[PDB]
């Protein structure tokens, strides 16, 4: 049975990260923000809270807005998704140092939870008004949801297949997933990989607030996520995209690239039991988890490090925890990035592994904000107060979407 | 390294397959037209063509529309792909005789190309008639892209991941090619996979004629849809969606089915070479051939028949001509089921990988309409006039699409 550890499967790195957040556009400074205990999360400025008189009016916006770095050009012949997968494209090639690789062997896998939603309405709009010679030439090109990925394909150069996994909240850790089989199956020696997602807007916030899975803890913005925490009351938006470069070991020796971390395996499983609720008992999310493992060739007691979902919505957490202690891995050091950087759909997963190999490289897990009375019902050893420096050696990046998605991918320290 | 042929992976088998079409809603109806050369394209008779004096008037609807099997709470839980995807699930799983398999061995890979994009415009109109408490707790759980293969692995059990995978016209093609490596890699046993789309509208019919992709031959239907013909003028929508069963072949004996035909191996590649265009060397798309058959463990002259793209525009043919030389599939039977099918995006690889698997399990390939004066430029041996009954031991589907997305599947007959 082929694994990382044994030889069956080639040794996979992770060679340049990138992404934007509500703290800085700049990965590195979003780092040191989390590790001082910074929050994304804002009153929402926005003239729509007040227009709709949204139950919700928090959130965090890009540090650094995509169209800030967007031309006239741009600005009429892509989607916003397309528009902030060429900025952080062109952000990560620049990071791994440029490199001339063979197109052949170079894949890219770019998830996103919805796509060009707004150039739909859009396109409509033109026809109502002049008739169907007012859609432009152009529309398929932007309206397509793999269009993201086609773009960082088309801008790079990736001949090795460019593809584009949807699974809502795991969108961004299912491409990174499917990234690693493209590479360990022969098809690809190098893998571009992420998830993008469009910004906060009044509709998904309707949408999801009639769930009740939105925190309405207004009058203290910052302290409204609370991943874990016996008083959470749902999650936070918060704007993300995030793109990794994996590479064989071997490709990455060749051309001198110094490895951030190690990617070891990937479980994709499904619950079968609600169309948008997490499964109480958590055990085929816990079997995800299991089998990144398997794959890697782990044991539990391997694992120091669990990045958790942690939507802190009552159920979410609830169900994650059993997650884990069905794994086996409630003895690890837990932390919940979106107490800090809020929920951003088909991108979080994506921008949470980059934090994940962050923490493998420093040896430091952040404190998961506003963790401040531990649910009897959870039980685990959520890092918080100050950032927790330890010797992390292998971690489980976890995520789990809407339809019962569940995506876990096992990393090692270089 | 790893093939079908040498026993690497294990054998994988075609155990039932499920169609609705614009000939019939049953795949066996389906294929006896075709062999009889009936057409499903006729002259579009919607309120609509007339409304927005659309260039393009013809296409297939479902000869059996989807809603005449859905009751009101179906109408008001699920986008139009959801309902097609559960009437197509429920189908299948009947087909294969209702078997009791392990939920746990058990995925789900269903692509589209779209999604449900009606319910935005739906949700939108709603919150602004009447405020955001408007929005349905449900709206999320219909919108979501992953919509239709959420409500399959729900509704058949499916907890070892629910995937979809979009590529536009390559979609359902793709998602049979993941739920093949779902299964090769020891995830799973036994898949549902294949593709929805919706139905023919006028924005989409406005978008690709806009780039001049469509027929608009209207005058005669049915002779309007020319894959490689010297006089053809582009595509035309024919509306489909398939879903085909697999599984291991130890776990078909095991439960005693009858497979219809072996699934061999499966090559995804890109063209990073325009958003809408094929590239015209057909290079990559060849190597998306030449990659199913390393993975089976064939020789290109092992190759009976090609189950064709074919759109039917004048690039499209020409490129999907130079792929195949590049593969050294040239001598192969050549059939462009599009011909009497029509377009269906994200659909129409899955209905033309279960036209590969009957071409295989009967020895008979349908004629391809409309094929009366061989383009110098191509020369491929297409099957025209009549079925040609053949000993076809090998095939392999191709499906590219807009991005440059290239998928073929190689074939076995059981
Ligand atoms: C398997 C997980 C499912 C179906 C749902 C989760 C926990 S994931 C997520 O992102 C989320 C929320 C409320 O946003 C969930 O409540
Ligand atoms: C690699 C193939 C690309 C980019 C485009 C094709 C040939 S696929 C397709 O379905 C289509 C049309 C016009 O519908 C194309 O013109
Ligand atoms: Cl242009
Ligand atoms: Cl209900
Ligand atoms: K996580
Ligand atoms: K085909």
Same mark, same amino acid.
């Given at each position: ?21 509500? =703290? ?20 929402? @400025? ?53 490199? @001339?690789?063979? &197109? ?13 939603? @707004?150039?739909?309405? @859009? ?13 432009? &030439? ?9 269009? #993201? ?21 795991? +969108?961004?850790s299912? #491409?990174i ?27 998904? =916030? ?26 959470? /009351? ?11 470069? =994996? ?19 990937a479980?994709?499983?499904? /619950? ?20 990144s ?5 782990? +044991? ?53 592994s ?10 430091? =897990? ?31 990046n ?10 876990a991918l096992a990393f090692?320290?270089?």
């Open positions: 049975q082929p694994s990382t550890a044994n030889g069956g499967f080639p040794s996979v790195v992770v060679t340049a990260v990138t992404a934007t957040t509500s =703290i800085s556009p700049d990965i590195e400074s979003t780092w040191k923000g989390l590790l001082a205990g910074e929050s994304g999360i804002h009153a929402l @400025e926005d003239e729509f809270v007040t227009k709709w008189d949204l139950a919700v009016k928090i959130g965090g916006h890009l540090k650094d807005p995509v169209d800030s770095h967007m031309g006239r050009l741009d600005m009429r012949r892509m989607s916003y998704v397309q528009r902030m997968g060429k900025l952080l494209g062109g952000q990560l090639w620049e990071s791994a140092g440029s490199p @001339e690789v063979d &197109p052949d062997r170079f894949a890219v896998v770019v998830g996103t939870g919805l796509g060009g939603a @707004e150039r739909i309405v @859009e396109s409509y709009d033109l026809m109502n008004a002049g008739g169907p010679r007012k859609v432009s &030439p152009l529309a398929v090109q932007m309206i397509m949801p793999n269009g #993201a990925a086609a773009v960082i394909g088309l801008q790079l150069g990736a001949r090795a297949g460019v593809m584009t996994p949807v699974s809502a909240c795991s +969108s961004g299912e #491409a997933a499917h990234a690693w089989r493209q590479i360990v199956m022969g098809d690809a020696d190098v893998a571009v990989c992420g998830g993008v997602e469009g910004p906060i807007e009044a509709l998904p =916030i309707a949408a999801f607030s009639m769930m009740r899975a939105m925190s309405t803890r207004n009058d203290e913005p910052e302290r409204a996520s609370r991943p874990f925490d016996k008083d959470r /009351d749902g999650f936070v938006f918060g704007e993300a995209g995030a793109l990794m470069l =994996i590479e064989t070991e071997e490709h990455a020796k060749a051309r001198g690239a110094k490895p951030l971390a190690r990617l070891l395996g479980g994709i499983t499904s /619950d079968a039991f609600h169309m948008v609720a997490p499964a109480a008992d958590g055990v085929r999310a816990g079997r995800a988890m299991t089998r493992l398997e794959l890697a060739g782990l +044991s539990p007691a391997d694992i120091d490090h669990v990045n958790a979902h942690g939507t802190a919505t009552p159920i979410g957490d609830a169900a994650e925890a059993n997650a884990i202690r069905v794994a086996g891995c409630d003895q690890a050091a837990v932390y919940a990035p979106k107490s800090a950087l809020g929920h951003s759909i088909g991108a979080v997963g994506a921008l949470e980059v934090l994940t190999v962050l923490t493998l490289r420093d040896g430091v =897990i952040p404190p998961t904000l506003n963790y401040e009375t531990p649910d009897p019902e959870i039980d685990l050893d959520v890092v918080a107060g100050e950032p927790r420096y330890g010797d992390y050696r292998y971690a489980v976890n995520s789990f979407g809407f339809g019962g998605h569940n995506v090692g320290r270089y």
